Amino acid sequence: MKWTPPRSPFNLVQEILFHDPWKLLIATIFLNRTSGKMAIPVLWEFLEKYPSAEVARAADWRDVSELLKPLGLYDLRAKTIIKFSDEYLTKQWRYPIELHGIGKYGNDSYRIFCVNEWKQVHPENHKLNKYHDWLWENHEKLSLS
């Protein structure tokens, strides 16, 4: 059994990014105090220019901040994203929270979507709760565990 997250009516962006933990965590950072309506389109623009942590760590933060300007929090995120992508590739880690820029919300997303620990996960984030609650209620109907 390998864990594959089901699609929910909430349409969390994590539901299509589960197979790429780096991209999922990048998405979390984009959603930090930022609406998904604004962040997600910019996310796709970012991902095409920086498809991996290899390219993102070798990136220049001025180009990234420029891309994050209409979202807000453009300067610090740009440096955070680069540093995170560097640590994700270098620093030995068991969970993404050990990395910089990722906190509880980013780490809970990982444990729910990227691995099967969603039973052991108790998220504080609102949208995560909705998906997490929707999970228990329908997991037997979707034949999950």
Next chain:
DNA sequence: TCAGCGCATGG
């Protein structure tokens, strides 16, 4: 614990 970050949108 908490200032700071930051622009857009609906109150």
Next chain:
DNA sequence: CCATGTGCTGA
């Protein structure tokens, strides 16, 4: 106008 949008770091 204030409040918040799928938060986190540093201190």
